[PDB]
From a paper:
The anaerobic, Ni-dependent CODH has a homodimeric structure containing a total of five metalloclusters, called the B-, C-, and D-clusters. The C-cluster is the site of CO/CO2 interconversion and is composed of a [Ni-3Fe-4S] cubane connected through a linking sulfide (SL) to a unique iron site (Feu). Here, we report the crystal structure of the CODH from [name] (DvCODH), which reveals a surprising and unprecedented conformational rearrangement of metal ions in the C-cluster and provides the first visualization of the cluster in an oxidized state. The overall fold and cluster placement of DvCODH is highly similar to other structurally characterized CODHs.
One of the more noteworthy aspects of the oxidized C-cluster is that cluster ligation involves one residue (Cys301) that is strictly conserved in CODHs but is not a ligand to the canonical C-cluster. To probe the effect of Cys301 in DvCODH, a DvCODH([name]) variant was produced and characterized. Similar to what was observed with MtCODH/ACS, DvCODH([name]) is inactive and does not contain Ni, as assessed by CO oxidation activity assays and inductively coupled plasma optical emission spectroscopy (ICP-OES), respectively. Unlike wild-type DvCODH, DvCODH([name]) cannot be activated by Ni under reducing conditions, analogous to what has been observed previously for DvCODH samples grown in the absence of the C-cluster maturation factor CooC. To investigate the architecture of a non-activatable C-cluster, we determined the crystal structure of DvCODH([name]) to 2.0 Å resolution and discovered an intact [3Fe-4S] C-cluster core with an Feu ion that adopts alternative conformations. Approximately 70% of Feu is in its canonical position coordinated by His266 and Cys302, whereas approximately 30% is in the Ni-cubane site. Thus, in the absence of the non-canonical Feu-ligand Cys301, the cluster cannot be activated by Ni and Feu appears to be free to occupy multiple sites. Taken together, these data suggest that the novel structure of the C-cluster that we observe here, with Feu coordinated by Cys301, is relevant to processes beyond oxidation, specifically Ni incorporation.
Numbering used by the authors:
A (entry chain A), B (entry chain B): 4 to 628
Write the structure that this text describes.
């Protein structure tokens, strides 16, 4: 089918799209086609539902009617409020994610989380001392853990003037944030204030609204996401470079296949541990299987890739197609980006769809709730359900379409600094010498509006050929991986200078830095380079890009990158084009305020030119050629 | 004129609607007409904009097309998520309001709030002892205040299992909330979790979404709103019964008229203090004015009414018309329900439109930001701006249309118990005897869809006639006041049992209990009666109603009343009718979850019948003969 080829660049997607057609299974692409054309007002953002004096739409009519909402709000306020709440939903997703890590570490500290431990005691002591815990280096690890928990919880309270991790940002940046009123003070507080501001008759100034959206996104990047990342490393180990594989071919016909989907490693690590217990493995063999095979989806797949090397079956738009292989015996979900269609598709097979979080409820799913005190017991129970489902798999409907592609993962900042010999000097020398011209974090999702991974891959290829090193997170990981970009030998794909540096360090030209919360690592690394050099983040030769974004979380990531000084490309526009003032603030006005702005460009080669031009401009202001 | 009489029941509204039409001033009614018909999908709730795989619309078709969103979400999920975020917006308004009160009491305890003090030390010592402050009766007041501030701030953190004021609810109700997973744990936390739940691919079950909507609302009523109410009494005095007046005729031609609009008394109490300084009054006398006249709008007006007896100019739909009088020399606004059209109407006169809050920014307004450390100095500056605006008032454009009408205000729970002799027994005895059959809180807004105050007033009259005492708060206060029902002589309008009780106590049949946050006084009073009788709130002959609601805050108030066991009538439907399952849950399902449910009924006599019927059934539950 020509339509099927138009939907993805990957062979495995085409194979499963053909299989779904022959079986009568509708996909995300079919539903997108039904939802086209979209409502013009919703698309432009010129519609409001925030009270029942409405709902309102802002139109351009020759009689001048419908220029304002019933309360008097114009298109600038309505668009800005809609964008503000959109960002707040993304920040809330990462807020709750980090809060779960705090609760988990606290349970470990009190000895009430069987099977969870402090995997990286050294990092616990370093992070705790950094945040002010007295005698963190010498006191018993659990006492230090309880004092660190208290610090992170205070960031989720209402008495701080600035988040604890904000100290990593250079002083010039903290001074500018304070001057603009952008300093994030509380992870939950900024979210709550955004919902108050967007109520009828509170914040009715588009500038002020976008300013607080930046403060809310900063409370994510330097708060919710950074806490989640750093505590995840403490509980489950700091990532280190390791080999693994990617694509639908990671599923095995001869094994029980358990797909982990969602976001939080507190569940996926414990599922993986369950499948490794000898009695559970023996139950799989009693059922006729050779082994139990865990395969990751989306960000929780990234978490297992980074710390355990678990192969990843696919990213966002592969999630339905992974069930269409007919070889998934269970999908285990927690929260965020889990399309509810997956429940219906799993019902077309033997596959069990298991929910684990009180926040991630799906009508028709099997719910086995996981908490720190019962995780070890419950995850054992979930794996036993997958083995039971395996015995009823229909072999006639199994089609695992491809051979897996080799990848390298595990590039935390600790691993990067280890590869460099303990200091960022060799990396700074490479940038000053022009071998590495700059860095671009390529982040974010897939979106049915764009042929899947076409922009992700093209942009990655363009940047490394221009001696720009790519830091990959989120669903871009799978795209870079399937394109053969995540291995040390991929230096052959990069420009002469980047390839030389990569070969001298033994690293790939695209560094997998983890999940979407792990974009906080990109913030930490920028802050480190800026502080070492004595400049602002907005002076560094850096950029960020989400060529195929879809979610509120991706928009919050883009906003905190911009607000931290990182020019940020988006493949598609947010629903803001109904207000030229808001659009001009996002694309230009922010540049004059925070030192960076949004870019919207659907052509990935054009996007490469723009990100490169920003990097060239910033190199010149550092005195570099 | 027929159209004009159709828009309000009041003479002062009629006069300003004529003046507004003659002057070409666009009102909330004119814009509501332009926005009719509304978008069918928006009004039904079957539209989603939570990610850019969409936006999506759900149609009902036999062919099954557009039955699901791009992510596969159906109408139940889309409607429930929309209503969840709607509720969260209202809870957030009360959250930030209560938070501002904590910060003010802290500044007083620190000695860093010139012009503020602990007005009610006895209540501070009583609230602090109640919440667990050690030696609250003897330790220095500022030490006790600091320990209370710590407790309230902890309820804005992420470490509690249940909010501090939740201990007021009866044990049976606390046990049900705990089993349902509905117990409010953190004011900001429940708001953030709702925004997480409503992100794509998180909570995709309408029952679970509605249960957290209840938890989020309960974090308002027993958290943000109850903290706001109790600290306001501590900082500004516990209200006690007093007389005052209402309507546009409270503005005086010979005086500088300052309208306080918005919500937080932290601003309006200091505006009033400023108008009493001898030097400032001399400046007004220099300008030709005989006095400085402060008058209240909406909830901040309710606050000044309850504690200082300051006359009230109007409620929500009177706000624009108050400027149309041509005698408003300044509007002093903070946040919530402040229609931005007021800025344009102010621009049509001499009136200064002054914003005071970093959250309540309005393009084109004069911003004089107020915080505890500078309120005394800044509020003086604001009054001077009003005096200067007075000098430019055009006498020929002034039309103050009515003479003010007498009311009685200040019925805090402390005031009610004092009137009863110290204990609630005389009220309990009157209910047992059937002199008072029950109590209904009539709360909430005006809405252009309903002839202003018509349903508010008709419901109030119907209920007292049936021996049901009415507790009024919010913008219903102005309606009851202008109807002449807020005075002890209104006993002649009540049934025989209610009139005898009111005359023996010397109180009106309609008790003004304060602002929207003071709906927490109604929760406190229901909890007291239930604990005294040893029953649940869902056993009490109580009810709640908002016949003309508009705002997210009102929907949140209705939800926390429903979730606390109080049957709640709404005059208009939330945007949920696109899902029969969500609608059936709101109107029927919740009875079997929380012991109460919503009602939607635009006929206020019908609404009285339904509220009365619930009261009859609850009297039977208590064995009353
Ligand atoms: S807040 Fe204003 S623009 Fe939005 S729905 Fe209500 S009246 Fe319309
Ligand atoms: S969350 Fe689902 S229903 Fe809502 S806009 Fe995105 S794809 Fe459409
Ligand atoms: S669906 Fe109502 S405006 Fe888009
Ligand atoms: Fe992601
Ligand atoms: Fe109100
Ligand atoms: Mg715990
Ligand atoms: Mg500021
Ligand atoms: Mg203070």
């Amino acid at each position: 089918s020509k339509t099927i080829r138009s939907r993805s660049i990957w062979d495995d997607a085409h194979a499963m799209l053909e299989k779904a057609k022959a079986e009568g299974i509708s996909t995300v692409w079919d539903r997108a086609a039904e939802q086209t054309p979209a409502c013009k007002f919703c698309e432009l953002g010129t519609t409001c539902r925030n009270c029942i004096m409405g709902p309102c739409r802002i139109a351009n009519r020759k009689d001048g009617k419908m220029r304002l909402g019933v309360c008097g709000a114009d298109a600038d306020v309505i668009v800005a409020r809609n964008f503000g709440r959109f960002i707040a939903g993304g920040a809330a997703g990462h807020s709750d994610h980090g809060r779960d890590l705090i609760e988990t570490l606290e349970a470990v500290a009190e000895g009430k989380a069987p099977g969870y431990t402090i995997r990286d005691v050294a990092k616990l002591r370093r992070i705790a001392a950094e945040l002010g815990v007295a005698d963190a280096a010498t006191r018993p690890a659990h006492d230090v853990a309880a004092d660190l928990v208290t610090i992170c919880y205070n960031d989720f309270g209402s008495r701080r003037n600035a988040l604890a991790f904000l100290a990593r940002a250079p002083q010039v940046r903290r001074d500018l944030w304070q001057r603009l009123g952008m300093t994030p003070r509380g992870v939950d507080r900024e979210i709550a204030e955004m919902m108050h501001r967007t109520h009828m008759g509170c914040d009715n100034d588009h500038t002020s609204l976008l300013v607080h959206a930046a403060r809310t996104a900063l409370a994510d990047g330097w708060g919710g996401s950074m806490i989640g990342t750093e505590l995840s490393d403490i509980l489950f180990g700091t990532p280190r470079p390791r080999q693994s594989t990617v694509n639908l071919g990671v599923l095995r016909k001869d094994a029980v296949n358990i797909l982990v989907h969602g976001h939080n490693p507190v569940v996926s690590e414990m599922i993986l541990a369950a499948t490794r217990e000898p009695a559970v493995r023996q139950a799989a063999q009693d059922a006729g299987a050779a082994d139990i095979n865990v395969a990751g989806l989306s960000c929780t797949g990234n978490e297992l890739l980074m710390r355990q090397g678990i192969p990843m079956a696919g990213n966002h738009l592969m999630t339905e197609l992974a069930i269409v292989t007919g070889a998934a015996d269970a999908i285990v979900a927690d929260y965020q980006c889990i399309m509810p269609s997956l429940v219906q598709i799993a019902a077309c097979y033997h596959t069990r769809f298991v929910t684990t979080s009180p926040k991630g409820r799906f009508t028709g799913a099997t719910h086995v709730e996981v908490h720190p005190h019962n995780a070890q017991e419950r995850c054992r129970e979930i794996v036993m359900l997958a083995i039971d489902a395996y015995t009823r798999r229909d072999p006639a409907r199994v089609d695992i379409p491809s051979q897996p592609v080799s990848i390298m993962s595990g590039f935390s900042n600790e691993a990067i600094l280890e590869a460099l010999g303990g200091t960022p000097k060799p990396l700074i020398d490479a940038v000053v010498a022009g071998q590495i011209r700059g860095f671009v974090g390529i982040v974010g999702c897939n979106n049915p509006k764009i042929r899947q991974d076409s922009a992700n891959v093209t942009l990655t290829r363009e940047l490394i050929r221009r001696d720009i090193m790519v830091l990959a997170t989120g669903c871009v990981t799978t795209a870079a991986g399937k394109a053969g970009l995540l291995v040390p030998e991929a230096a052959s794909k990069a420009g002469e200078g980047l390839a030389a540096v990569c070969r001298s360090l033994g690293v790939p030209p695209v560094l997998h830095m983890g999940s979407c919360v792990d974009n906080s690592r990109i913030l930490q690394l920028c802050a480190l380079l800026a502080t070492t050099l004595g400049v602002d983040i907005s002076d560094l030769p850096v950029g960020a890009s989400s060529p195929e974004w879809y979610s509120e979380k991706a928009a919050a990531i883009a906003m905190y990158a911009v607000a931290s000084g990182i020019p940020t490309h988006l493949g598609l526009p947010p629903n803001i084009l109904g207000s030229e003032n808001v659009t001009a603030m996002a694309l230009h006005g922010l540049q004059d305020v925070v030192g960076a702005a949004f870019m919207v460009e659907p052509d990935p080669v054009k996007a490469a030119d723009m990100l490169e031009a920003h990097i060239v401009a910033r190199r010149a202001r550092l005195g570099l050629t």
